[PDB]
Write an enzyme that holds these catalytic residues in place. Structure first.
Site, short mmCIF file in Angstrom:
data_model
loop_
_atom_site.label_atom_id
_atom_site.label_comp_id
_atom_site.label_asym_id
_atom_site.label_seq_id
_atom_site.Cartn_x
_atom_site.Cartn_y
_atom_site.Cartn_z
N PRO A 1 45.53 11.19 52.85
CA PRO A 1 45.28 10.09 53.79
C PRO A 1 43.78 9.81 53.79
O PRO A 1 42.97 10.73 53.90
CB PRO A 1 45.78 10.65 55.12
CG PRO A 1 45.61 12.14 54.96
CD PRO A 1 46.06 12.38 53.55
N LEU A 2 43.41 8.55 53.65
CA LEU A 2 42.00 8.18 53.60
C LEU A 2 41.63 6.98 54.46
O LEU A 2 41.91 5.83 54.11
CB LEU A 2 41.60 7.91 52.15
CG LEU A 2 41.74 9.13 51.24
CD1 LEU A 2 41.67 8.70 49.78
CD2 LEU A 2 40.64 10.15 51.56
N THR A 3 40.98 7.26 55.59
CA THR A 3 40.53 6.21 56.50
C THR A 3 39.49 5.34 55.78
O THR A 3 38.45 5.83 55.36
CB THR A 3 39.91 6.85 57.76
OG1 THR A 3 40.95 7.42 58.55
CG2 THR A 3 39.17 5.81 58.58
N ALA B 1 45.09 7.47 58.29
CA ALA B 1 45.38 7.74 59.69
C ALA B 1 45.62 6.40 60.39
O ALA B 1 44.79 5.50 60.32
CB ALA B 1 44.20 8.47 60.34
N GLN C 1 50.34 8.32 57.77
CA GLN C 1 49.83 9.36 58.64
C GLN C 1 49.68 8.79 60.04
O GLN C 1 49.07 7.73 60.23
CB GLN C 1 48.48 9.88 58.13
CG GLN C 1 48.02 11.13 58.87
CD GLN C 1 46.63 11.59 58.46
OE1 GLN C 1 45.67 10.83 58.52
NE2 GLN C 1 46.52 12.84 58.04
N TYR D 1 41.32 15.95 65.73
CA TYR D 1 41.92 14.93 66.55
C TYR D 1 42.86 15.57 67.56
O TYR D 1 42.99 16.80 67.60
CB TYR D 1 42.57 13.88 65.65
CG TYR D 1 41.50 13.24 64.79
CD1 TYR D 1 41.43 13.49 63.42
CD2 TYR D 1 40.47 12.50 65.38
CE1 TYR D 1 40.36 13.03 62.66
CE2 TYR D 1 39.39 12.04 64.63
CZ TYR D 1 39.34 12.31 63.27
OH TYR D 1 38.26 11.89 62.52
N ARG E 1 50.17 17.64 58.70
CA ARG E 1 48.90 18.07 58.14
C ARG E 1 48.08 18.88 59.14
O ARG E 1 48.02 18.55 60.33
CB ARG E 1 48.07 16.86 57.67
CG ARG E 1 46.97 17.26 56.69
CD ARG E 1 46.13 16.08 56.20
NE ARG E 1 45.61 16.35 54.86
CZ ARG E 1 44.54 15.78 54.32
NH1 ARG E 1 43.82 14.91 55.02
NH2 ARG E 1 44.16 16.09 53.09
N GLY F 1 41.56 13.59 47.66
CA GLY F 1 40.90 12.63 48.52
C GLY F 1 39.90 11.77 47.77
O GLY F 1 40.20 10.63 47.41
C1 LIG Z 1 36.33 8.22 53.46
C2 LIG Z 1 37.27 9.33 53.83
C3 LIG Z 1 38.35 9.06 54.71
C4 LIG Z 1 39.30 10.07 55.12
N1 LIG Z 1 40.36 9.75 55.98
C5 LIG Z 1 41.26 10.71 56.35
C6 LIG Z 1 42.37 10.42 57.21
O1 LIG Z 1 42.62 9.26 57.69
N2 LIG Z 1 43.24 11.47 57.56
C7 LIG Z 1 43.07 12.79 57.08
O2 LIG Z 1 43.88 13.67 57.43
N3 LIG Z 1 42.03 13.08 56.24
C8 LIG Z 1 41.17 12.09 55.89
N4 LIG Z 1 40.10 12.41 55.01
C9 LIG Z 1 40.01 13.77 54.49
C10 LIG Z 1 40.73 13.71 53.12
O3 LIG Z 1 42.14 13.46 53.29
C11 LIG Z 1 40.62 14.95 52.28
O4 LIG Z 1 41.28 16.06 52.96
C12 LIG Z 1 39.13 15.35 51.97
O5 LIG Z 1 38.53 14.20 51.30
C13 LIG Z 1 38.98 16.56 51.10
O6 LIG Z 1 39.77 16.35 49.91
P1 LIG Z 1 38.99 16.00 48.46
O7 LIG Z 1 38.08 17.17 48.17
O8 LIG Z 1 40.14 15.85 47.50
O9 LIG Z 1 38.20 14.70 48.67
C14 LIG Z 1 39.14 11.41 54.60
C15 LIG Z 1 38.02 11.68 53.70
C16 LIG Z 1 37.12 10.69 53.32
C17 LIG Z 1 35.99 11.10 52.36
O1 LIG Z 2 36.08 9.88 57.68
C1 LIG Z 2 37.02 9.55 58.37
C2 LIG Z 2 38.08 10.51 58.69
C3 LIG Z 2 39.18 10.09 59.49
C4 LIG Z 2 40.20 10.98 59.81
C5 LIG Z 2 40.15 12.32 59.34
O2 LIG Z 2 41.17 13.17 59.64
C6 LIG Z 2 39.06 12.75 58.54
C7 LIG Z 2 38.03 11.86 58.22
#
Ligand SMILES: Cc1cc2nc3c(=O)[nH]c(=O)nc-3n(C[C@H](O)[C@H](O)[C@H](O)COP(=O)(O)O)c2cc1C
Ligand SMILES: O=Cc1ccc(O)cc1
Length: 368
Positions: free
Chosen positions: A23-25, A58, A100, A192, A241, A328
């Site tokens: 999940p990536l915000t 999210a 998510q 959160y 998660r 991510g």
């Molecule tokens: C720009 C950005 C937005 C993210 N948004 C979310 C999110 O909405 N929900 C979540 O559980 N994790 C979020 N993450 C955390 C990622 O899901 C992921 O767990 C984290 O980037 C580490 O994984 P990676 O090493 O593969 O990047 C976000 C990370 C980044 C960098």
């Molecule tokens: O960077 C934004 C972000 C949002 C929700 C998360 O769980 C982790 C990072």
């Protein structure tokens, strides 16, 4: 990477591969209505539809309870309508996608929330403990001024049971039955709401089924929300998660291992589509073998995440330590990551400086 590219049975579905998009915000939604900006968001997800599974960013379950200023919501018809277009585009490419579900809890933006239904116009969390480690990120702030998180109100067990949980349930039903998502992922990580009840640093409740005095009661909210959502949309369409070692927002528990293991045993009876976890901390402060912990205490689908590369991912799946790995940063920078895995093509390097531009820049500008 034969193990990483191998199909996987997850819930009532079958992934084409084990390369999951975490999940990536990205903040590509309308500010006050939190409606997905389809034009950009659709192409973004469609471009990555080759992923074994896409876990959409999210998404808000409580009206106006925003934590990222312009993140998507799944509580209104307007949001549902656009999401459906996005989900339809992913499905036309043969992909799968879960949404998510989140509640920012004490990470809610005061200037937006307080400027607004016994749950409306209020900051809510397990305890009246504000985030103190850092300011509200400028890309999440409601103004150009330096904004800081506020002191949330302690939720009563009643508001939790009958206020918070129902929101997650309607959000899941909306996502699955209306938007057509294949499933939903309960956001019980990264500081959160749910994570705030989960780990001891942020949950100081003296009594009730969600007391912060024991690991079991701290795991209760995650379980109740997940259970209620399961009854509503089917457990094979629900994932969860967690991030037992993520220090964001000063989050910390003294027993990350026992906590994680106990939660695994507690949700085991739910037969979730999967359990998704961050195996570490963004920095090297909180450390532990989360992969090992979940491995020995959970018999369902295990999706690990955090600083994985194709080889390490492939190797752990090969050893049976994880069933799949969610990426991510790599998915942000590589729409065709899966393809690049099939041929070991080099990967585009991500650029954190442009993760939240809210424009095409740093969003849909990564080449394939
Ligand atoms: C720009 C950005 C937005 C993210 N948004 C979310 C999110 O909405 N929900 C979540 O559980 N994790 C979020 N993450 C955390 C990622 O899901 C992921 O767990 C984290 O980037 C580490 O994984 P990676 O090493 O593969 O990047 C976000 C990370 C980044 C960098
Ligand atoms: O960077 C934004 C972000 C949002 C929700 C998360 O769980 C982790 C990072």
């Amino acid at each position: 990477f034969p193990e990483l590219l191998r199909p996987l049975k997850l819930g009532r579905y079958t992934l084409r591969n084990r390369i999951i998009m975490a999940p990536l915000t990205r903040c590509q939604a309308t500010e006050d209505d939190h409606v997905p900006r389809t034009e950009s968001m659709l192409k973004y997800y469609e471009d990555r539809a080759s992923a074994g599974l896409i876990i959409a960013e999210a998404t808000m379950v409580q009206p106006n309870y925003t934590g990222f200023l312009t993140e998507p919501g799944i509580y209104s018809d307007a949001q549902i309508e656009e999401w459906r277009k996005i989900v339809d585009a992913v499905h036309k490419k043969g992909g799968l996608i879960f949404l998510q579900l989140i509640h920012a809890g004490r990470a809610g933006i005061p200037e937006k929330i307080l400027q607004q239904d016994p749950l409306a116009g209020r900051l809510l969390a397990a305890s009246a403990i504000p985030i103190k480690d850092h300011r509200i990120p400028a890309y999440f702030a409601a103004s150009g001024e330096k904004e800081t998180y506020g002191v949330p109100e302690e939720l009563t067990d009643d508001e939790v049971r009958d206020g918070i949980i129902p929101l997650f349930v309607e959000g899941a039903k909306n996502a699955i039955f209306k938007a057509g998502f294949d499933g939903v992922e309960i956001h019980g990580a990264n500081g959160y709401l749910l994570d705030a009840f989960f780990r001891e640093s942020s949950n100081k409740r003296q009594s009730g089924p969600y007391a912060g005095t024991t690991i079991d009661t701290r795991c209760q909210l995650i379980y109740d929300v997940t259970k209620s959502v399961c009854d509503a949309v089917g457990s094979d369409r629900v994932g969860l998660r967690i991030s037992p070692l993520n220090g964001v927002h000063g989050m910390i528990d003294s027993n990350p291992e026992a906590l994680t293991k106990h939660l695994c045993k507690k949700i085991e009876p739910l037969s979730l589509a999967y359990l998704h976890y961050l195996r570490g901390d963004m920095v090297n402060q909180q450390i532990g073998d989360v992969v090992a912990w979940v491995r020995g205490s959970y018999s369902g689908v295990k999706i690990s995440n955090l600083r994985y590369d194709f080889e390490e991912a492939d190797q752990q799946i090969r050893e049976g330590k994880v069933d799949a790995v969610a990426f991510g940063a790599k998915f942000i920078a590589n729409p065709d990551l899966v393809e690049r895995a099939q041929q070991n093509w080099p990967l585009n390097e991500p650029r954190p400086e442009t993760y939240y531009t809210r424009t095409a820049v740093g969003y849909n500008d990564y080449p394939t």
